[PDB]
Amino acid sequence: KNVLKIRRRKMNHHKYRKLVKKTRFLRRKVQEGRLRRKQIKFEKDLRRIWLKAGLKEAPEGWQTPKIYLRG
Amino acid sequence: ATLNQMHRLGPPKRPPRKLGPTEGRPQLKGVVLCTFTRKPKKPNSANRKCCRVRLSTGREAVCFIPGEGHTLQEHQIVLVEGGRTQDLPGVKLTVVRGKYDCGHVQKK
Amino acid sequence: GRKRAKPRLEQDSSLKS
Amino acid sequence: PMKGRFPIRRTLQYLSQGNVVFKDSVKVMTVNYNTHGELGEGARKFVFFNIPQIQYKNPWVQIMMFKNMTPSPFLRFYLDSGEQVLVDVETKSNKEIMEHIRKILGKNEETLREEEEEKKQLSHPANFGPRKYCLRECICEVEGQVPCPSLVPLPKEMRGKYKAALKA
RNA sequence: AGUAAACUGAGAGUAGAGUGCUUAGUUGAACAGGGCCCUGAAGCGCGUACACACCGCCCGUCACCCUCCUCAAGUAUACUUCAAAGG
RNA sequence: AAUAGGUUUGGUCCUAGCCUUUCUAUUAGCUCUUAGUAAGAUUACACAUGCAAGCAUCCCCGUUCCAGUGAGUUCACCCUCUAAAUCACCACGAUCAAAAGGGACAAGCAUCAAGCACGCAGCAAUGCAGCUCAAAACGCUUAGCCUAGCCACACCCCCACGGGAAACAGCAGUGAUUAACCUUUAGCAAUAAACGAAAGUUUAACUAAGCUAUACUAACCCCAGGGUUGGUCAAUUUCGUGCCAGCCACCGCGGUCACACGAUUAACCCAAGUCAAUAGAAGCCGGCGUAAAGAGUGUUUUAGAUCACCCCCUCCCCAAUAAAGCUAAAACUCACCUGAGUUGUAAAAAACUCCAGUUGACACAAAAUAGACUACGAAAGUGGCUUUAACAUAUCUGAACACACAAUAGCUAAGACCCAAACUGGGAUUAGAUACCCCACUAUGCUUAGCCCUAAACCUCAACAGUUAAAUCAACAAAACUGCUCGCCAGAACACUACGAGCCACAGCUUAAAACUCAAAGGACCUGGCGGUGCUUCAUAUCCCUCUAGAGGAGCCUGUUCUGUAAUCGAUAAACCCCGAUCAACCUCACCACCUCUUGCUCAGCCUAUAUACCGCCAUCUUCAGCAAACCCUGAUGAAGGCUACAAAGUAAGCGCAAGUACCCACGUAAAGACGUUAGGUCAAGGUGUAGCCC
Numbered sequence A: 001k002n003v004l005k006i007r008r009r010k011m012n013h014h015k016y017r018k019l020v021k022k023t024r025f026l027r028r029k030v031q032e033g034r035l036r037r038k039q040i041k042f043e044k045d046l047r048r049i050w051l052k053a054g055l056k057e058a059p060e061g062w063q064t065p066k067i068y069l070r071g
Numbered sequence B: 001a002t003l004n005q006m007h008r009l010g011p012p013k014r015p016p017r018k019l020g021p022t023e024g025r026p027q028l029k030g031v032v033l034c035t036f037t038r039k040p041k042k043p044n045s046a047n048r049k050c051c052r053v054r055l056s057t058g059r060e061a062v063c064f065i066p067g068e069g070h071t072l073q074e075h076q077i078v079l080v081e082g083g084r085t086q087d088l089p090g091v092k093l094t095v096v097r098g099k100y101d102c103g104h105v106q107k108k
Numbered sequence C: 001g002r003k004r005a006k007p008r009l010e011q012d013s014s015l016k017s
Numbered sequence D: 001p002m003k004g005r006f007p008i009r010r011t012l013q014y015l016s017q018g019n020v021v022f023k024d025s026v027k028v029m030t031v032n033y034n035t036h037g038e039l040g041e042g043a044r045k046f047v048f049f050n051i052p053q054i055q056y057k058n059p060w061v062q063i064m065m066f067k068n069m070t071p072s073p074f075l076r077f078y079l080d081s082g083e084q085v086l087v088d089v090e091t092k093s094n095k096e097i098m099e100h101i102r103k104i105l106g107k108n109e110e111t112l113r114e115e116e117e118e119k120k121q122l123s124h125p126a127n128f129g130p131r132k133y134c135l136r137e138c139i140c141e142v143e144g145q146v147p148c149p150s151l152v153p154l155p156k157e158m159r160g161k162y163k164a165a166l167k168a
Numbered sequence E: 001a002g003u004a005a006a007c008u009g010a011g012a013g014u015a016g017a018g019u020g021c022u023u024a025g026u027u028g029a030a031c032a033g034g035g036c037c038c039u040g041a042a043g044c045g046c047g048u049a050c051a052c053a054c055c056g057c058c059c060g061u062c063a064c065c066c067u068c069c070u071c072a073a074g075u076a077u078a079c080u081u082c083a084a085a086g087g
Numbered sequence F: 001a002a003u004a005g006g007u008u009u010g011g012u013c014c015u016a017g018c019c020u021u022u023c024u025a026u027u028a029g030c031u032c033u034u035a036g037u038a039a040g041a042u043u044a045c046a047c048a049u050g051c052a053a054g055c056a057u058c059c060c061c062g063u064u065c066c067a068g069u070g071a072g073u074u075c076a077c078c079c080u081c082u083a084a085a086u087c088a089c090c091a092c093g094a095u096c097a098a099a100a101g102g103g104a105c106a107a108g109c110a111u112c113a114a115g116c117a118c119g120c121a122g123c124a125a126u127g128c129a130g131c132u133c134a135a136a137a138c139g140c141u142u143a144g145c146c147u148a149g150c151c152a153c154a155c156c157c158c159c160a161c162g163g164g165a166a167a168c169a170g171c172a173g174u175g176a177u178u179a180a181c182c183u184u185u186a187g188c189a190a191u192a193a194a195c196g197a198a199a200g201u202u203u204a205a206c207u208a209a210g211c212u213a214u215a216c217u218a219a220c221c222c223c224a225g226g227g228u229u230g231g232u233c234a235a236u237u238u239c240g241u242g243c244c245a246g247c248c249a250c251c252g253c254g255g256u257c258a259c260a261c262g263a264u265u266a267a268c269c270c271a272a273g274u275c276a277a278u279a280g281a282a283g284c285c286g287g288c289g290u291a292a293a294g295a296g297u298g299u300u301u302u303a304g305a306u307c308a309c310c311c312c313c314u315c316c317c318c319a320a321u322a323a324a325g326c327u328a329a330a331a332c333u334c335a336c337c338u339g340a341g342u343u344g345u346a347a348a349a350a351a352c353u354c355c356a357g358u359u360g361a362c363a364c365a366a367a368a369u370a371g372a373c374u375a376c377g378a379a380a381g382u383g384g385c386u387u388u389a390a391c392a393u394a395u396c397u398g399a400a401c402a403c404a405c406a407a408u409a410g411c412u413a414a415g416a417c418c419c420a421a422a423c424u425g426g427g428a429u430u431a432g433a434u435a436c437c438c439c440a441c442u443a444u445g446c447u448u449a450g451c452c453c454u455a456a457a458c459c460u461c462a463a464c465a466g467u468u469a470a471a472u473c474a475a476c477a478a479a480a481c482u483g484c485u486c487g488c489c490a491g492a493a494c495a496c497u498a499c500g501a502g503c504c505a506c507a508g509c510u511u512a513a514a515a516c517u518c519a520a521a522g523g524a525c526c527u528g529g530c531g532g533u534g535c536u537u538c539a540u541a542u543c544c545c546u547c548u549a550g551a552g553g554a555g556c557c558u559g560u561u562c563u564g565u566a567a568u569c570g571a572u573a574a575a576c577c578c579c580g581a582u583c584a585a586c587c588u589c590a591c592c593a594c595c596u597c598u599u600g601c602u603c604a605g606c607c608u609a610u611a612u613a614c615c616g617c618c619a620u621c622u623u624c625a626g627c628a629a630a631c632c633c634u635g636a637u638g639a640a641g642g643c644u645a646c647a648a649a650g651u652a653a654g655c656g657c658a659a660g661u662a663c664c665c666a667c668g669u670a671a672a673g674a675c676g677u678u679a680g681g682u683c684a685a686g687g688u689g690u691a692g693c694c695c
């Protein structure tokens, strides 16, 4: 068979890889911001739990970890 | 698929039908913003009279004005219906001749 | 660019006659 | 074509051909059958062919199946009183199994005929209403009675538009 | 091959007009083997996204251009939830 | 989607979307006679005014109903238990029917996958740690519903103490708003409800009217309109227009013959309607080698299947895997001797010259021959030697995510480094060369320990079981199928993308949309064209060389081009260019300037346009040998194809070639030379279609 469908996919992937290459510094700043909001959204979900259960502060000795950082 | 698979998936779900430019409505009222002509896509050759109107829904759209000769002007009221102009890409609305400020085509 | 009609769509009146 | 072997089983006509309508005492029917063995062949055909018909006629009776739990196939019925009815089906054909449980726990043809008659009392022919519940909607449909004004206009004398006009 | 080459005459058409054309004759050769890049044909194949038929079709950057969407700093607005509780 | 139809291609078949035809509703345009009947804000936005609940010897009862709306939305159904209410009173019941308890009960999204206290035991104290959930919990979004009717709501804060605030979602009516638009009528006579002991009283419930082609039914002396008329699809004459104006549901139409545009004529269909827009009605038992689809591999879970007992025939070995050890050939390096060059290719340059050749020593790299074998392993992979360990399951099926793997490339750290080698540098090529060609060298290919988790991970054939008889079968691939199960798919493109989530991944992987756009996209095959396409044999004055005389340089002659001129036209690659002309000083003559004539040499005339309307006569391949009616057969009766002589489906009239004839023969030269190719040449030989001119 012909490879015309593969050729369409080939160009789409080449242009995408090149686009990501050109903007990899902007995309890295955007990704960093999303992970911060993701962490904040996670901390809120846990705070909602103890607050809806009648507690006024987090359980004694509980520190919400950073589960989205590269470290 | 097997009977067990057909049972587990259930009856087919139709895609929710896509509302057109009239948003599932027969006609819409619009206010003319500007008038101009559009070139039909090849192989057709013409200067098709179109206009941009603000629809009652708030969204602005390009509408084809059918017939030979019109007198539409900015700030005038027109009624627009569905129906694509086959040779005008993106033109999916048509002005209703004989309603509000758009009159009937003058004979010959 | 003179429009070239499709040969399969070419109309004929043999039946109409 | 319809998927599976014996697609007739998945038709409303087939499912309505069951003759076993359990008495109200029957609450649960367990079927213990074996996948292999020549002596359990009727029990396999009974599960294959007749369990769907039994369930169709007895939607509120729990039917549970158990494979290869014992050396021979048997049916056990649990009644509301607390009584249990063990039916040994080894060596019996599927048709004999259906005939057996019909005799010992199925409603006779007389008891079923009566129920059908009591249902006919619910749709009285003399009643008028929507076609869903009644044969006729209005007395105007009866020949000899004053027809509907939608089909035949009434005399001016029988119309309120003209009774008041003369009176006024 | 009486060919090429050379030489000589006649005719058509004009009132006249060609170094042109048509045609008759004279003298009168050399070579004819070997090859298939090229040119073209024949045969048998192979591929084909072209069919306006390779002067074909066709991909992408950039330019212009309209329609739609995504991301996005700071900020504002609106909405949702609470008492489904405790003393 | 059906009795189907149209639409992809040069063509055929297949697949597939879109659209047509049918039936309703709403709105728009245009049009419209009557009667009867039914039905009738777009808006849970704001409302002027009037009315919509009274009754009755005071108490009470009623105003908790009816009427309205569709905002919200699994309080509607069944069962159990049991209030209020009806049966004057008791009902020891029936009827009706709350609260409570049990069960059942919409759609879409899994890119909402975890919820976060959601359970149990105990008299209590208290103890246990459970409960829901891919068979869809939790969550988001949408929607009144299952219509003798039911549910919900009643301006908002779910509620209505309270607060905001001052309420038509009661009838009639109004404003705003929307494509959407009924009277500010009458009567309590009928029925229903309230009240009364009752005669009765009241009620915008309701009844009877008003308004409206939204529908139904009936009628019309008189009075018909709307749309359509290229195909689908019933039905077009004459003009105008000339890719413009416009048209089109789809395919498409429009550049001088427009049945498709506009007008006009006629016709077709329906008809007091017509039919433009919109919406709805008809959607899974079909597929997954190549069209969308078998996800790289195996396992199992809750389950499903009957392929599990019976009932049986490929255990061991060959290139599985892991570990350790080992080395034959060839490199590299070093040493001696010798040589002065070696390397590089179509050819060069650059590079090296402690270089090359012989001999010897020599690896953490890679594994000729066997292997023409077709084995091992789940797949990926696995082919030098030895040894150790070792290749799950006595029914099958069973995961993007669980579990464990998974070439090459790549990442992190420490090593090895012969050779190869991205990148980079140099040489050359080129219009350019960030390439192809040459040289050097690095990451990398190796080892160790961690990652990453992709492939055209492909026999492009899911696992298991069974069959070879049916129809063999769209096509090609790989003969055609059945049972059963899981996975997956539902026009193209957007998109191996966006967002979400997960991940040792951070320029990544996995899962994976939508908006705008289109009428196709796509699969297989056939034909043609073309190929910097293969092989083979050829051209006889012939493609190259060979033979002879020329052209190309000079002058002249002549044609054309260009320039010039007030001043023809045609030919114009082969197949124009001493060509139409076997011929222009006037004439010829068709051109230019000036002057003149107007029924004109002609029952006019035109060398005006169109050779892309033609006849006529020709060029061209042809320095060919084929064209072909009528039949027959093959391919499943697909587009297509049809020959074998020891013959296997072709027979063929006619035409051409041939034969014959002309010239001096039977040789040669002429003549002849089909169909078709170039819309080839000629409207200016003459004739002529169409269009144009007529002082």
Ligand SMILES: NC(=O)c1ccc[n+]([C@@H]2O[C@H](COP(=O)([O-])OP(=O)(O)OC[C@H]3O[C@@H](n4cnc5c(N)ncnc54)[C@H](O)[C@@H]3O)[C@@H](O)[C@H]2O)c1
Residues within 6 Å of the ligand: F134, F302, F399, F401, F402
């Ligand atoms: N998700 C479960 O834990 C679960 C439990 C019981 C049965 N199953 C069965 O697994 C099949 C797949 O279910 P789905 O479509 O809802 O899941 P899915 O394939 O959409 O996967 C969603 C989740 O289920 C897991 N899952 C996928 N396949 C599974 C399988 N075969 N068994 C168990 N877990 C699986 C995935 O890892 C993931 O966590 C069905 O046949 C279902 O009945 C699944």
Ligand code: FES
Residues within 6 Å of the ligand: D137, D138, D139, D140, D141, D147, D148, D149, D150
């Ligand atoms: S339906 Fe009976 S009178 Fe109309």
Ligand SMILES: [K+]
Residues within 6 Å of the ligand: none
């Ligand atoms: K179709």
Ligand SMILES: [K+]
Residues within 6 Å of the ligand: F055, F056, F061, F195
């Ligand atoms: K009272």
Ligand SMILES: [K+]
Residues within 6 Å of the ligand: F070, F144
């Ligand atoms: K609602």
Ligand SMILES: [K+]
Residues within 6 Å of the ligand: none
């Ligand atoms: K409310």
Ligand SMILES: [K+]
Residues within 6 Å of the ligand: F188
């Ligand atoms: K009354």
Ligand SMILES: [K+]
Residues within 6 Å of the ligand: F230, F260
């Ligand atoms: K038409």
Ligand SMILES: [K+]
Residues within 6 Å of the ligand: F367, F384
């Ligand atoms: K070896």
Ligand SMILES: [K+]
Residues within 6 Å of the ligand: F458
């Ligand atoms: K392959």
Ligand SMILES: [K+]
Residues within 6 Å of the ligand: none
């Ligand atoms: K070909």
Ligand SMILES: [K+]
Residues within 6 Å of the ligand: F551, F552
């Ligand atoms: K010369």
Ligand SMILES: [K+]
Residues within 6 Å of the ligand: none
């Ligand atoms: K001709």
Ligand SMILES: [K+]
Residues within 6 Å of the ligand: F683
């Ligand atoms: K002529």
Ligand SMILES: [K+]
Residues within 6 Å of the ligand: F683
């Ligand atoms: K002519």
Ligand SMILES: [Mg+2]
Residues within 6 Å of the ligand: A008, A011, A012
């Ligand atoms: Mg692309």
